[PDB]
Amino acid sequence: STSISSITTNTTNLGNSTAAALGGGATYDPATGAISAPSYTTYNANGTTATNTSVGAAIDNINANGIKYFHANSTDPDSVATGTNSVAIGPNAVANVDYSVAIGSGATTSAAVPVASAFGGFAGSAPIGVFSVGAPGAERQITNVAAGRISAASTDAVNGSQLYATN
Amino acid sequence: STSISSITTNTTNLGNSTAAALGGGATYDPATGAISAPSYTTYNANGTTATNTSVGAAIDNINANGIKYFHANSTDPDSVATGTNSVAIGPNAVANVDYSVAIGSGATTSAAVPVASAFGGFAGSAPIGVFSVGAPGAERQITNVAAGRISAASTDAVNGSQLYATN
Amino acid sequence: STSISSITTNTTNLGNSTAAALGGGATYDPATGAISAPSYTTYNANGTTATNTSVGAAIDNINANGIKYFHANSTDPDSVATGTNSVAIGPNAVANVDYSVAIGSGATTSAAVPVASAFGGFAGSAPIGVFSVGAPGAERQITNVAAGRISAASTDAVNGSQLYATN
């Protein structure tokens, strides 16, 4: 009788503390023993959100569709980053060269080639690694590039209008 | 009495297994029925971490502030990636062109324009898609670009010092 | 006796609803009081997956090794994005300039330098910010860049073959 009272008090503490730990608006109802389902919002890649009613569904959505501000629309193999401090972003991206980035579907990394001259005094003649936007035969056109400084010191990229102008 | 014993044994198994499933250092106390709150670390965008005491808080922080090594500082609309295998990163980024990337706040994607000549024998004359660092009137200056190979085969970007040198 | 029945019914509802909220295939066994451990898949950076048997382990893996399609291979300090709407990706990346991107290990951002002429009529003469693939003395060679349009309007990046051709 005191034992019964002890149990119901304890199961209410169990219920409440499980509900607290879950968050997402979960609540415990001592009348039924039920924790109301949590609601966890995840961000789809198409400008919409999903409501998840379990932690596992939310975790799965995070991997399948990304997080807010970081979306890759794919079902293809995961990116692979094995280079030291390397970053691989998008389906089938591979960043195996150290201190490098592969970004874009199927992007790969190969070793940087130092270029000091070809015309001398090039800035950024000693690359730490590569920043790849694609792969051989699968190149990407880099777009919306502001005009870069044209100077001996400049490590800004140059755009097509600048090459147009010099010619 | 045996029924009571049965229940307390079972609620301890419920408590322990709920605590196990939660992780984050959650523990069950049979004396009170309470699961001690989990502690889940998330990574803020400002070089600090947050301690979350529910799964929902942690999930919400992951979306709001990013994950370790992947941070976008914003409260603006989510990125949208609807192109096949496309990647959209940052607030208001839109990657609707297939096999493309939009990266940076407000970046957009338009179709790649194949360029074989303008001067002939251009490498990377058949782009698979675009890698956008911005949008018309909202361009980004691409910086810290190492000198690229200057050769007929080269699909390296060129920097401003290289254009400076050739002129 | 009715009180006992009440409790076991309620603890089964507690068990089931905790198992539901957890997902990951967790199930409640009324015979033992045990919730079977959840299984949450996270994506490693090396082309493999991890099986996590707690929410906390899964959250920790998400931060340590990334999410599917978004991987940074590192144990170095977190990226920092403090610029308004800025994005910082990779270990030690810092995007403190507004509307900017730092991407790649140790990448930094400095203010964009508007360039209208150096040779006039440059497109993208008013950058909104920078897109940095590195830092001074730690530059990255940008690779697999498709040929950009060579025109007065062009904000496409140019590759080395294009500079080769014009020279």
Numbering used by the authors:
A (entry chain A), B (entry chain A), C (entry chain A): 5 to 122, 129 to 177
Please give sentences taken from the publication describing this entry:
TAAs are a family of outer membrane proteins that adhere to host cell surfaces, and thus have an important role in virulence of these pathogens. The BpaA head structure exhibits a novel fold of an intricately interwoven trimer that contains modular structural elements from other trimeric autotransporter proteins. The structure of the head domain of BpaA exhibits a tightly woven trimeric quaternary structure.
A 2.05 Å resolution data set was obtained in house on a crystal soaked into a solution containing 1M potassium iodide. Four iodide sites were located for phase determination. Each of these sites contained strong anomalous signal. Of the 178 amino acid long construct, residues Ser5-Ala122 and Phe129-Asn177 were modeled. Although only 4 sites were used in determination of the experimental phases, a total of 9 iodide sites were located and built based on anomalous Fourier maps. The coiled-coil regions of other TAAs have been reported to bind ions.
